[PDB]
Structures are given as C-alpha cells and as structure tokens.
Paper text:
[name] is a pH-dependent, polymer-forming protein crystallization chaperone which, when covalently fused to a protein of interest, forms a stable, well-ordered crystal lattice. A point mutation of the [name] motif causes it to be soluble at pH ⪆ 8 and to polymerize into well-ordered helical polymers at pH ⪅ 8. Target proteins can be genetically fused to [name], which promotes crystallization by ordering many copies of the target protein along ordered [name] polymers, which associate to form the crystal. To address these challenges, we designed multiple constructs with several types of linkers—rigid (helical fusion), semi-flexible (Pro-Alan), and flexible (poly-Gly)—of varying lengths to fuse a designed ankyrin repeat protein ([name]) to the [name] C-terminus.
Numbering used by the authors: 2 to 235
C-alpha cells in the first residue's frame, strides 16, 4: 500500500491535469491495476468529475469502474450540504459540479435556507441563474418566512431581484413579520429595487405586523428619496 501524495488529498475539483495523471498512477500501484495509458484522461479534476461511470468504463476497459468509484469516494457523502456551502460562498464552478453529481437544487439547511436563498443574499447572480434553470423553488420560505426575493431585495442585489421576478417570484410574499420585499428594500435603502418591485406589482399599501407600509419605513429611516418614489405611487 502506497500513501496518496499530499496535494492529491485536496478535493479533486482543484486537481490539475498533471495531478489527475499522478492520481491514476498512484491508483495503478495501490490497486495493482493493468498499466494505465498516459493519454487516457487528458483533463483536469473538474472535468473528471463531470464524466459518468459509463465514460470511465469506455476510457479504461480494465480499470475505469474502479477509478470512478475511487474518485466518487473522495467527495463528501452529503452533496446537498456541500451545495448549500458552495452557493453561499459564490463557488460557481463547484455549484455546477455538485449538481451534476446529484446534489439537490432544493437542499435546505436547519434555518430553511436553500442554495437560491444564499446565492441571492450574497450577490451570486450566476449561481442564481444556474439554480433557477435546474428547478430551484423560486418562492420557498425559510424558517422566518424569507423568500429568495426578500433576501435579494434586502441585500441590494438588483439584477438578482429582476431575474427572480422573471422566473415567477411572488412580488408580494410576506415573511413572518408581515414584511414584503418592498418593505425590506425600503428598510435598507435600495431605491432601484423599490422601483423594479413597484413596476412588477408590489403593493404599496401592504402593512407589516406593526401596521407599517414601506412608506412608513422610509419615513422612520429619514430616506426622503425612497419616500418620494413610494409617495408618487400611493
Ligand atoms: Cl442532495
Ligand atoms: Na486546471
Ligand atoms: Na500541476
Ligand atoms: Na481518452
Ligand atoms: Na455522474
Ligand atoms: Na483516494
Ligand atoms: Na445529498
Ligand atoms: Na433538503
Ligand atoms: Na454583495
């Protein structure tokens, strides 16, 4: 038995093509495989993770199934949890690889956050787009009632707000405090998001648990520019 080199103990998404080649040679020795042909897996580790098991079998009639299993065993068991983390951290390529390997696009943590909530909150537009294209629940509430549109409106991510609306986000969804996305955009001073929400049917007269409209919130915060938009339309 041979120990795997230290840089190959990194997750395979980080492996170069030369790293892949070293891993193959390590496996040839560790598992007593038929000699591996040097031109056979001419790609980096990110690409390797997108091959199917059938692809491995075709590429290596003698060892490809074994190599596929070895590679998959390197990955953590809970890909849905990894997807939540990758989406939160903006790891767009990792998001794509994890969903290709079966991660649930609607993976949910103990706060009710989904990948879409986390990518929306942290401004990761490309990840929002890939999640939506692959069936992400656009109107899922988290435990406090926050939808992805709430999360993008509160955090000032205008393009994400627009994409969520184009994919069916509920413009007048309520969180557990009765806040709509319009309330949260007003609370955090995002004037352009307020305009987009109104153009998509946001209810200026919606009252939260405190009896307050988005306009009331703009007055409490002294944000006269936001109050002006809201006043015009109600
Ligand atoms: Cl999953
Ligand atoms: Na590379
Ligand atoms: Na290298
Ligand atoms: Na090949
Ligand atoms: Na696969
Ligand atoms: Na290994
Ligand atoms: Na999983
Ligand atoms: Na889940
Ligand atoms: Na940001």
């Amino acid at each position: 038995s041979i120990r795997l080199p230290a840089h190959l103990r990194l997750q395979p998404i980080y492996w170069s093509r030369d790293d892949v080649a070293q891993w193959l040679k390590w496996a040839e020795n560790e598992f007593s495989l038929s000699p591996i042909d040097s031109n056979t897996f001419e790609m980096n580790g990110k690409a390797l993770l997108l091959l199917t098991k059938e692809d491995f079998r075709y590429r290596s009639p003698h060892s490809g199934d074994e190599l596929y299993e070895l590679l998959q065993h390197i990955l953590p068991a809970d890909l849905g949890k990894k997807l939540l983390e990758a989406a939160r951290a903006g790891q767009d390529d990792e998001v794509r690889i994890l969903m290709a390997n079966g991660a649930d696009v609607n993976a949910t943590d103990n706060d009710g956050y989904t990948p879409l909530h986390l990518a929306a909150s942290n401004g990761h537009l490309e990840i929002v787009e890939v999640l939506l294209k692959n069936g992400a629940d656009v109107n899922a509430s988290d435990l406090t009632g926050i939808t992805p549109l709430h999360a993008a409106a509160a955090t000032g991510h205008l393009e994400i707000v627009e994409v969520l609306l184009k994919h069916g986000a509920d413009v007048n969804a309520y969180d557990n405090d009765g806040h709509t996305p319009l309330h949260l955009a007003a609370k955090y001073g995002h004037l352009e998001i307020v305009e987009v929400l109104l153009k998509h049917g946001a209810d200026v007269n919606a009252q939260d648990k405190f009896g307050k409209t988005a306009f009331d919130i703009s007055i409490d915060n002294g944000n006269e520019d936001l109050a002006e938009i809201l006043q015009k339309l109600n």
